[PDB]
Amino acid sequence: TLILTKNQVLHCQFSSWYSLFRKLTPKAKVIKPIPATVLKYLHEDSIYVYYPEREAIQLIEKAIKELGGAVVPKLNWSTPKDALWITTTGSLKCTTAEEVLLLLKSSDFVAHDLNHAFDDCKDFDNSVPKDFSFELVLKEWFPMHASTEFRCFVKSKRLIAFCQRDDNYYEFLKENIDCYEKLISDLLKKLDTFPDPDFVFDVYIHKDRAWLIDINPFYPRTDGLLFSWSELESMNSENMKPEIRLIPK
Ligand SMILES: Nc1ncnc2c1ncn2[C@@H]1O[C@H](COP(=O)(O)OP(=O)(O)O)[C@@H](O)[C@H]1O
Numbered sequence: 109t110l111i112l113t114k115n116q117v118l119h120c121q122f123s124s125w126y127s128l129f130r131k132l133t134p135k136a137k138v139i140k141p142i143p144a145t146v147l148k149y150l151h152e153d154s155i156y157v158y159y160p161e162r163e164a165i166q167l168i169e170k171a172i173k174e175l176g177g178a179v180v181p182k183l184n185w186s187t188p189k190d191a192l193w194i195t196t197t198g199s200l201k202c203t204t205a206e207e208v209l210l211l212l213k214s215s216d217f218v219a220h221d222l223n224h225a226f227d228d229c230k231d232f233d234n235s236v237p238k239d240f241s242f243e244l245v246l247k248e249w250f251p252m253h254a255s256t257e258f259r260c261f262v263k264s265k266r267l268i269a270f271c272q273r274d275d276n277y278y279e280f281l282k283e284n285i286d287c288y289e290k291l292i293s294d295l296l297k298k299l300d301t302f303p304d305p306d307f308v309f310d311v312y313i314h315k316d317r318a319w320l321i322d323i324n325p326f327y328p329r330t331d332g333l334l335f336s337w338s339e340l341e342s343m344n345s346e347n348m349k350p351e352i353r354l355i356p357k
Pocket residue numbers: 134180185186187189200247248249250251252254257273310321322324
């Protein structure tokens with residue numbers, strides 16, 4: 109019953125919401141459109157240990173320098189969180205263009221952005237829409253406490269649910285859940301310019317400050333984590349309290 113439109117996917121591109129919410133979200137640079145030689149390199153399906161032209165490499169490392177020397181890369185929608193297995197350090201942290209490119213090339217999520225981004229859109233048959241372009245996003249890296257990140261579900265512009273984003277129990281959350289809820293609620297009021305009524309936003313809350321991390325479609329390809337999409341779909345938006353789930357001890 110839940111359907112996904114082309115516009116819903118387009119509205120969640122990093123460039124589309126970073127613009128809206130620059131004051132709420134960690135610093136980032138966007139290279140758009142993505143350099144063609146970079147795009148060409150990212151489609152390689154090699155497993156063993158071509159390369160973009162120097163101009164692209166310098167452009168990327170200019171952005172890295174400007175962000176303080178360490179970044180997390182992504183394309184329009186997906187962060188290559190799945191591709192930690194290929195990094196020499198086990199981290200999303202990239203300090204050179206080589207590291208950025210290796211991480212992006214090895215991600216299933218990134219590959220999904222590149223080849224299948226609009227395949228679930230009922231109003232778009234398949235290939236990409238007019239006036240669309242891929243973009244290379246370099247987010248400033250910062251160490252973040254995995255257990256104070258949340259995924260927050262919005263339906264008819266109301267917060268119906270949110271959950272802990274990682275999978276480790278963290279007792280501090282239980283004692284402080286009303287504080288987290290208020291900060292998430294307050295952030296959602298500041299997302300008033302987001303154009304769709306239903307969506308999913310990720311937040312990092314640190315020292316009483318909420319940071320917007322990502323916005324994704326209200327659709328089962330967005331991991332529901334501690335919620336199932338069956339319950340998210342049926343959940344009533346008129347409730348005055350959101351459902352809150354944390355990892356059990
Ligand atoms: N700027 C950053 N610095 C450090 N870690 C990050 C940064 N951005 C994202 N991460 C880590 O990568 C994971 C994926 O982040 P996100 O950008 O929300 O991608 P997605 O929404 O595709 O999961 C997050 O859970 C976070 O732990």
